[PDB]
Ligand binder design. Structure first.
Ligand SMILES: CCCCCCCC/C=C\CCCCCCCC(=O)OC[C@H](COP(=O)(O)OCCN)OC(=O)CCCCCCC/C=C\CCCCCCCC
Ligand code: HEM
Ligand code: HEM
Ligand SMILES: C/C=C(C)/C=C/C=C/[C@H](OC)[C@@H](C)[C@@H](OC)[C@@H](C)CCc1oc2c(O)c(OC)cc(OC)c2c(=O)c1C
Ligand SMILES: CCCCCCO[C@@H]1O[C@H](CO)[C@@H](O)[C@H](O)[C@H]1O
Lengths: 99, 48, 263, 370, 62, 74
């Protein structure tokens, strides 16, 4: 079920209807803000446009034509490698802080 | 218990008539201003 | 094929002007023209004769945000009258009053133009220029400026403020300065055979005649504060502008704000 | 006079996509100003002596020019204030706005302060609900071990709600709204540091629009609808949201048999009434409001807003339906089957907030593989 | 060779701010009188014979 | 927070029309109603169930209360 239920949840969540990728929706804490800053230019510029487009659709209370919805099978984490490292670095600094 | 009974209803009539005018007018003003955002179009042109 | 089609259709004798300026006599030019351009076609089918239709002007804005660029370029214009219109003289006087400016001008804070003066003392832009681009029956009347990303709003504010000031309060002394600048621009421009030749070629195409300096002077002389206020009001006051921005333009004012700034 | 009037309003960057739920903040500001203006005009004719309080209010309504409209605007204004308050808080919970910790906590203090202010204002006319409301609510402090009784009598200025109580309640009611205004200004100062959240819960820095003219005009429209709702009540149903019992002067020897709180206090009242223990009821009452301060700590979702969280939305609406249930129960007699529905509804309230919602947040994170 | 109503209203009353201001002013005065009288008439008609002004004649002459 | 210092955006073009060049209610009903219907359908499974439950408890409880107060012959 999980993958069956996952794809169902993904579409029920609906950020894909605004053309967003899952990582575009993450709550931005300080770890995340640093990961974003580290993104290569193209990934950063793509994220910016998908968010701008989604905010614009939200403002009009509209969604994209179904053929343009982000697809569950294609959504991948572009943020993960950067964020994981940012979190590992901070954990390391905390270990040293305990002397 | 309510000597203002008749007066409040007369004012109520005027209030409804005024809102009947002012609400669609302000609403048209809102749509007028917002039309600039509502019809804006976006294009992403990254060098590639 | 596309090119030959284009050429056969537009390069017709009735659409051309052979102009010349310098040490030569008209008869000689005419002589040479009769000898070398007589074979030039003076016709092109029934549905060939290309004709210009009016071009609608649309109050609008195009913003190409590119934060990677160091300076922002903004161009804003209202619809102008078109080449043949007499209003162009009073509009050139108005544009001369606001003027142009760049960081290398020596006048700085003492410049007569309030915009140039404010721009210089507050370092609001690298440069700016008013313009009156004319086409057959329409045109672009406005200005272009280049500035730092944090100065766009201020530039727009002062620029629009100056347009409104001219619409409602142009003074005789500044209009006299505008007229003098325009007089000097006209004469200093027609200096040399090339500028004169082009003025001949282009004037015949647009006005259908060469407008003499004596006529330009008369048209300029007719302009006074009242005329500047009325003509500027006609084209600027409460009119929708066309706005184009390129570069770090996050601070370019929203169109509604720009539009409100027109009145 | 330029700045702070601006760069602070006109060119304030606002998300391009905030919906109507973002209008309640300005509407609360308007309710506050309406209450303050009508209140001040009422204060110009009200006397706080227990022998003249009720009479001075009838004089306002009967003989003061337009006194009745100012009086009913103040009364219904309080109700509109609460409708807006609850919508405002609801918006914050659904959209994860509470992550703006300082703004949200000052918000919680505002809520408690407005409740205290409305309560005291309600005592001023000195009708039956005024008197018993003053007795019951101040007595909540008596649940405090060993000193509660001392505190109550101190507040009352005696051994029972009397002259001393009414006079100080008029002075407290008078000054609190101004304190609320100052705290609301701090509420806003803290918000301007981050700017507003938006329906998607995603950062809107890439699509900000100026506050003026977009939201200034959107706020005006919202204000007009607020005025419409308020005047419909005042001019066509001024007592709809009120209690007939307060048209009867205070009688300290008799508590009306069907006494009940103002409608906006019914849910909390249902909760307190659900617990057959004094201290237990008062602690649950207090916690029903103070739990708002815990919401930020109970956020488990990797996403800020509920927009993209179907399970959370279902629970959110169950919570809203539960508050509606508690509001209905609070208006009913303490009899079967209401006693049990109220207890269940009270348990559900805390269950939703403390367990179900955080759990849903974690389940949704799993479903999204992070 | 003919302007529409709104285009005419714009040129005469709405373009200048001072005229636009004077149009709203006189507009408000003429509007108030006519709105109030019309609204009252509707009210008194809806309540024909019930108001004091309607039965007042039966007792006056004082 | 002020315009000019919000964030970094590159390669995005925005096109807009003056409000005086456009209708304020374009397809108000033709496209409006359909959108409202889409939006309504998109949330009703999330919003409605709880209130139907309240509606059920309310009618059941009210009726249960009324029944309990009458005819108890014995
Ligand atoms: C407190 C006690 C008072 C008693 C409570 C009585 C409450 C009665 C119910 C009134 C609420 C009105 C419901 C109408 C909303 C229906 C609706 O449209 O819901 C779906 C819609 C979908 O929106 P998005 O997820 O952003 O997606 C956009 C896609 N185009 O969701 C929303 O509008 C969410 C906004 C809800 C916030 C307001 C909720 C009402 C508040 C009530 C009580 C609040 C709780 C806290 C109080 C504790 C003290
Ligand atoms: C957040 C602000 C306020 C709230 C929520 C509020 C609420 C109330 C309530 C619920 C009542 C009872 C009304 C009734 O049923 O008769 C009341 C009464 C009163 N309030 Fe306020 N009030 C506010 C501000 C003020 C202010 C600023 C003043 C004075 C400067 C004021 C003066 C009065 C007076 C004199 C009465 C008694 C007359 C009456 O009962 O209408 N109020 N208020
Ligand atoms: C006297 C009461 C209040 C006043 C006058 C007030 C006013 C405002 C205003 C003007 C805004 C900005 C616009 C908006 O988002 O609505 C705002 C935002 C906010 N308020 Fe309040 N508020 C009040 C009470 C509260 C309460 C009770 C809470 C919560 C316990 C609260 C939480 C918030 C939060 C979290 C925001 C940011 C919303 C967002 O950006 O999504 N406020 N408030
Ligand atoms: C000097 C100032 C003082 C002492 C102010 C203290 C204010 C405390 C709180 O505000 C912060 C309080 C208003 C707030 O509790 C969180 C409310 C939800 C309390 C709700 C409430 O109302 C009742 C009410 O109104 C009544 O009227 C006829 C009668 C009542 O039972 C018979 C009640 C009642 O049983 C409760 C729980
Ligand atoms: C907007 C719909 C409001 C709900 C109508 C009922 O309203 C309720 O009526 C009771 C008496 O019947 C009052 O004692 C109570 O205070 C009031 O809130």
């Amino acid at each position: 079920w999980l993958e069956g239920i996952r794809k169902w949840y993904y579409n029920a969540a609906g950020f894909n209807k605004l053309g967003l990728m899952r990582d575009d929706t993450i709550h931005e804490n300080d770890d995340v803000k640093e990961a974003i800053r580290r993104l290569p230019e193209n990934l950063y510029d793509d994220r910016v446009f998908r968010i701008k487009r989604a905010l614009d659709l939200s403002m009009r209370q509209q969604i994209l034509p179904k053929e343009q919805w982000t697809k569950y099978e294609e959504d991948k984490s572009y943020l993960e490698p950067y964020l994981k490292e940012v979190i590992r670095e901070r954990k390391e600094r905390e270990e040293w802080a305990k002397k | 218990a309510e000597p203002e009974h008749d007066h409040r209803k007369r004012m109520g009539l005027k209030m409804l008539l005024m809102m009947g005018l002012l609400l669609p007018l302000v609403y048209a003003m809102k749509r007028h201003k917002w039309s600039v955002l509502k019809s804006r179009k976006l294009a992403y042109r990254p060098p590639k | 094929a596309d090119l030959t089609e284009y050429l056969s259709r537009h390069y017709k004798a009735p659409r051309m002007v052979l102009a010349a300026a310098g040490g030569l006599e008209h008869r000689q030019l005419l002589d040479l023209a009769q000898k070398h351009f007589s074979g030039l076609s003076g016709t092109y089918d029934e549905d060939a004769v290309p004709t210009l239709s009016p071009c609608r002007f649309t109050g609008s804005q195009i913003c190409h945000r590119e934060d990677g660029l160091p300076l922002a370029h903004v161009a804003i214009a209202v619809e102008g009258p078109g080449w043949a219109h007499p209003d162009n003289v009073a509009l050139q006087v108005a544009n001369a009053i606001i003027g142009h400016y760049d960081c290398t001008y020596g006048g700085g804070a003492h410049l007569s133009s309030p915009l140039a003066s404010i721009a210089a003392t507050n370092k609001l832009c690298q440069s700016f220029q008013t313009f009156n681009i004319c086409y057959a029956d329409t045109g672009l009347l406005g200005a272009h400026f280049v500035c730092d990303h944090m100065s766009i709003d201020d530039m727009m504010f002062v620029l629009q403020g100056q347009w409104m000031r001219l619409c409602t309060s142009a003074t005789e002394s500044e209009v006299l300065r505008g007229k003098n600048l325009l007089r000097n621009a006209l004469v200093s421009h027609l200096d040399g055979t090339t500028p004169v030749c082009e003025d001949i070629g282009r004037s015949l195409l647009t006005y259908g005649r060469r407008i003499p300096l004596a006529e330009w002077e008369s048209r300029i002389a007719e302009v006074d504060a009242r005329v500047v206020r009325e003509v500027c009001s006609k084209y600027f006051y409460d009119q929708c502008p066309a706005v184009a921005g390129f570069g770090p333009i996050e601070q370019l004012p929203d169109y509604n704000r720009i539009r409100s700034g027109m009145f | 006079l330029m700045k702070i009037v601006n760069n602070a309003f006109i060119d304030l960057p606002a998300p391009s996509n905030i919906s109507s739920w973002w209008n309640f903040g300005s509407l609360l500001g308007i309710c506050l100003i309406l209450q303050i203006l009508t209140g001040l005009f009422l204060a110009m004719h009200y006397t706080s002596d227990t022998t003249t309080a009720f009479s001075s209010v009838t004089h306002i309504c009967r003989d003061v020019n337009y006194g009745w409209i100012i009086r009913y605007m103040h009364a219904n204004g309080a109700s509109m204030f609460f409708i807006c308050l609850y919508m405002h808080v609801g918006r914050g919970l659904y959209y994860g706005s509470y992550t703006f910790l300082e703004t949200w906590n000052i918000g919680v203090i505002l809520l408690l302060t407005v409740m205290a202010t409305a309560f005291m204002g309600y005592v001023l006319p000195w009708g039956q609900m005024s008197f018993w409301g003053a007795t019951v609510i101040t007595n909540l402090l008596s649940a405090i071990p060993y000193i509660g009784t001392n505190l109550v009598e101190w507040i009352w200025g005696g051994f029972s709600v009397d002259k001393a109580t009414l006079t100080r309640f008029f002075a407290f009611h008078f000054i609190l709204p101004f304190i609320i205004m100052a705290i609301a200004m701090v509420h806003l100062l803290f918000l301007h540091e981050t700017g507003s959240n938006n329906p998607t819960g995603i950062s809107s820095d890439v699509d900000k629009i100026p506050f003026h003219p977009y939201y200034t005009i959107k706020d005006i429209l919202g204000a007009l609808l607020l005025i419409l709702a308020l005047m419909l009540l005042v001019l066509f149903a001024p007592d709809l949201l009120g209690d007939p019992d307060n048209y009867t002067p205070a009688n300290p020897l008799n508590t009306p048999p069907h006494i009940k709180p103002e409608w906006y206090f019914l849910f909390a009242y249902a909760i307190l009434r659900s617990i057959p223990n004094k201290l237990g009821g008062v602690l649950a009452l207090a916690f029903s409001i103070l739990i708002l301060a815990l919401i930020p700590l109970l956020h488990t979702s990797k996403q800020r807003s509920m927009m993209f969280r179907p399970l959370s939305q279902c629970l959110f609406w169950a919570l809203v339906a539960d508050l509606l249930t508690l509001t209905w129960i609070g208006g009913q007699p303490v009899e079967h089957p209401y006693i049990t529905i109220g207890q269940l509804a009270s348990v559900l309230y805390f269950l939703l907030i403390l367990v179900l919602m955080p759990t849903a947040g974690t389940i949704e994170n799993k479903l999204l593989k992070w | 060779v003919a302007p529409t109503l709104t285009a005419r209203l714009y040129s005469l009353l709405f373009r200048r701010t001072s005229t636009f201001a004077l149009t709203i002013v006189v507009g408000a005065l003429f509007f108030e009188r006519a709105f109030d009288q019309g609204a009252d008439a509707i009210y008194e008609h809806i309540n024909e014979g019930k108001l004091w002004k309607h039965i007042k004649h039966k007792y006056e002459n004082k | 927070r002020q315009f000019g210092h919000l964030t970094r955006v590159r390669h995005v073009i925005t096109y807009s029309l003056s409000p005086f060049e456009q209708r304020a209610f374009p397809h108000y009903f033709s496209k409006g109603i359909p959108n409202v219907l889409r939006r309504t359908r998109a949330c009703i499974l999330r919003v409605a169930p709880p209130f139907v439950a309240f509606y059920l408890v309310y009618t059941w409880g009210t009726q249960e209360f009324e029944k309990s107060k009458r005819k108890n012959p014995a």
